[PDB]
Amino acid sequence: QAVVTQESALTTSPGETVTLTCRSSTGAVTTSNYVNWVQEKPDHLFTGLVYSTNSRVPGVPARFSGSLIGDKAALTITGAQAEDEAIYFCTLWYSNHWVFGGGTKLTVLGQVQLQQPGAELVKPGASVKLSCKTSGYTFPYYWMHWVNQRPGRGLEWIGRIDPNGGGTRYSEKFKSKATLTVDKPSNTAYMQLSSLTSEDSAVYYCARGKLGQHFDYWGQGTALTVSS
Numbered sequence: 001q002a003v004v005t006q007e008s009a010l011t012t013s014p015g016e017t018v019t020l021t022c023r024s025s026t027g028a029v030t031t032s033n034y035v036n037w038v039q040e041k042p043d044h045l046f047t048g049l050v051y052s053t054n055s056r057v058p059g060v061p062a063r064f065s066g067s068l069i070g071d072k073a074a075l076t077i078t079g080a081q082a083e084d085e086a087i088y089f090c091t092l093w094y095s096n097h098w099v100f101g102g103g104t105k106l107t108v109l110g111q112v113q114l115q116q117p118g119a120e121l122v123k124p125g126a127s128v129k130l131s132c133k134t135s136g137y138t139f140p141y142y143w144m145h146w147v148n149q150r151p152g153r154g155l156e157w158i159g160r161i162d163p164n165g166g167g168t169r170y171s172e173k174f175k176s177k178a179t180l181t182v183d184k185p186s187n188t189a190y191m192q193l194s195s196l197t198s199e200d201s202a203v204y205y206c207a208r209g210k211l212g213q214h215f216d217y218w219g220q221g222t223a224l225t226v227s228s
């Protein structure tokens with residue numbers, strides 16, 4: 001029942017130093033929450049910025065930095081650029097599941113690849129198998145996360161799979177809905193969703209992880225529509 005709270009929106013001007021924050025409802029944010037920061041640009045295009053409090057994802061501009069300040073986590077953008085206008089999400093680990101904050105809409109007044117199909121349209125009552133084909137890294141060395149986003153709702157972690165044995169961990173919401181597997185020779189991770197209803201219409205993302213390093217690279221998101 002943990003809730004992660006972020007500022008809903010902030011407006012900045014090019015060149016300013018701005019700090020976004022991420023609070024935990026049950027206590028101070030700690031290193032053991034392994035906070036990650038990700039950026040969403042149009043059209044539902046996610047990139048990883050920071051993992052595990054303060055590790056910047058290689059290739060991300062150095063103006064982005066993460067830290068813990070007092071009882072919460074913080075993403076500092078040191079000299080905002082016009083292209084930084086985006087939605088910024090944090091996520092915290094709570095013992096056995098990830099919880100996403102609601103995102104901060106930032107207005108600015110100015111090799112690793114995970115490949116997912118853009119969309120699928122499936123009838124109610126059917127099943128769907130969503131694919132996430134990877135390249136640019138040694139696939140068995142990393143887990144694959146899946147994340148859901150229903151219209152007007154927050155990001156929801158579905159679960160992860162470790163390709164060394166295929167061991168899964170699901171969130172409460174998806175523990176009897178999603179089935180994760182992989183095909184290592186084709187470098188592809190799969191998520192089946194069963195017993196589809198209109199409530200399953202959503203964008204579904206794959207995102208890379210591993211112990212201590214989560215959500216650094218994302219697929220584009222497959223928009224699933226469940227309709228006859």
Ligand SMILES: O=C(O)CCCCCNC(=O)Cc1cc([N+](=O)O)c(O)c([N+](=O)O)c1
Binds near residue numbers: 034093096169210213
């Ligand atoms: O590198 C080292 O040993 C040092 C780092 C050790 C601790 C890093 N913790 C995580 O990364 C959090 C986490 C642990 C899991 N677990 O323990 O199984 C998961 O299953 C899981 N998930 O997303 O489901 C997430």
